[PDB]
Amino acid sequence: KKYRFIVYTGVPVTRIMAQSTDDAISLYDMPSQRFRYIEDENMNWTNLDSRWYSQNSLKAIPMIIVPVPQGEWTVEISMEGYQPTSSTTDPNKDKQDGLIAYNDDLSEGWNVGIYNNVEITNNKADNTLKYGHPDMELNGCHFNQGQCLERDGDLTCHIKTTGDNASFFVVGPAVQKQSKYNYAVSYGAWTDRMMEIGMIAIALDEQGSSGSVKTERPKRVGHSMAVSTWETIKLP
Amino acid sequence: KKYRFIVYTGVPVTRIMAQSTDDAISLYDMPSQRFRYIEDENMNWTNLDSRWYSQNSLKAIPMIIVPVPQGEWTVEISMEGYQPTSSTTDPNKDKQDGLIAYNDDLSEGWNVGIYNNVEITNNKADNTLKYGHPDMELNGCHFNQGQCLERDGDLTCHIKTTGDNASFFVVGPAVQKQSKYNYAVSYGAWTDRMMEIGMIAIALDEQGSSGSVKTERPKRVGHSMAVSTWETIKLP
Incomplete structure (x- = not known):
């Protein structure tokens, strides 16, 4: 009778190695x-x-693995993709030195799939991008080969568990390794950077029926029209 | 007695004029x-x-003016300041061309004040920043004089209406006009740009008793420790 409501919020990060643009x-x-x-x-x-x-x-x-307690859930996710790169060495430790750009393939974006003991139905995965102006230059590099500064996602789906240790996964847009996507400031030596993956907010609403309200965030402006799909991502 | 819970969310924008960086x-x-x-x-x-x-x-x-319905309210605001600039014309209207940077003055950040017929008590306006790396270059200019890309806020207060048509206002960090903060892409002529002010999310919880789900804004990557401002902003 009382339906559960679970929220996960985080800003995933990961470590990269970058030499020159x-x-x-x-x-x-x-x-x-x-x-x-x-x-x-x-x-x-x-x-x-x-x-x-x-x-x-x-x-x-x-990919991020999200546990689901046993039950039937409406799952709502927002993802704000932005990859700023930052130094790890003083006195510039937390200072942004560039970014890693995305490509503009909205079919390779934010979505979900089965990790363990879930069935995912009635998906709607929306993906948008933000381009750079053709004269903008960041660390000597332009944005005229499809490079996107931001890749946002908005997703709602239905998740039914089929046992203990249940989880779905969230995939993000690809982290591009080729140099045309690398706008991290150049150094003569390979230099570790911290790279943000983006802000992820997940809500699990049991049978869509908890009635729980919370504060929210707006959709970022300047973003493209969304490409939407009902398809999910398969576990490899 | 139903305790109301009201959310405002938006990304305010404003128009600027810029020629070269x-x-x-x-x-x-x-x-x-x-x-x-x-x-x-x-x-x-x-x-x-x-x-x-x-x-x-x-x-x-x-400043942004926010209506408050009659009653007493606990107020929670999160602000994510980032000022990307873009053209007002076609094409490139949705393309980021650069940004306006902030200074690192955490004494001048997100805060609130009385606009009409409210009393504000228990104000705590926390502010953080994120620097650009001195070696980073954007549109021909470096981040080598303390320029900040982001200025974030986390605020709580109590608002009591003292008359009809009540409202408070939110102030943001200073929008810097000097050339050293201008990273909007250079044009040969004075050219209008749209500039984002930032993401603002306001929650009004009547007498703090609606039962809303309390989350917390994920602290964005690389931000400074918060500096607190206690006094509210006074209208001239």
Whole structure:
């Protein structure tokens, strides 16, 4: 009779290696990601498993594994994709030194799939992008080969668990490794950077019936028209 | 007795004039701001009034006026300041051409004040920043004089209406006009740009007792420790 309502919010990050704006970047294995878990107005931190869904020498797709308690759920997710790169060395430790851009393939974007013991139905995955002006230059590099500064997602789906240890995964747009997407400031030596993946907010509303209201965020402006799909992503 | 819970969310924008990154910018009068109003899972668009709270030769502080229904309210606001610039014309209207940077003055950040027929108590206006790296270059200019890309706020207060048609206002960090903060792409002529002010999310919780789900805004990557401002802003 009383329906559960669970929220996860987090800003996943990962470590990269970058030399010059003319060089491809390398990627560390993804770390576990600190998310805030909220249910019944008790609040705690949790680490969500994350890894590369796929990786090759051109790109890697990030994935985050989200546990689902047994039940039937309406799942609502917002994702604000932006990859600023930042130094790890003083006195410039937390200062943004550039970004890694996305491509403009909205079919390779924010979506969900089955990780364990869930069925995902009635999906609607929306994806948008933000381009750069043809004269804009960041660290000596232009944005005229499809490079996008931001890739946003808005997703709603229906998730039914089929046992214990149930989870779905969220994939993001690909982390591009080729040099045309690398706008991290150039150094003469390979230099580690921290790279944000984006802001992710997840709500699990049991049978869409908890009635729970919360504060919200607006959709970013300047973004393209959305490409939408009902398809989900298959586990590789 | 039903305790109301009201949310406003929007990304205010305003029009500027900019020529080359070596020139200062000019600020037009602020327009009305499109916000979403959310109460009892019922959503509508509304235009909030905005204007420059103050302006001197170097900078201007924006203000946005927020209606408050009769009663007593606990107020929670999150603000994510980022000022990307873009053309007002075709093509490129949706393409980011650059940004206007902030200074690192955390004594001048997001805050609230009385607009009409409210008393504001228990104000705590927290402010953070994110620097650009001195070596980063955007549109021919470096971040080597303390320029900040982002200025975020987290505010709580208590608002009690003391008359009809009550409202408070939100101020933001200073919009800097000097050339060293101008990273909008260079044009040969003075050219109008749209400039975002930032993401604002306001929650009004009647007597703090609606039972809304309390989340917390994820602290964006690389932001400074918060500096608190206690006094509210006074109208001239």
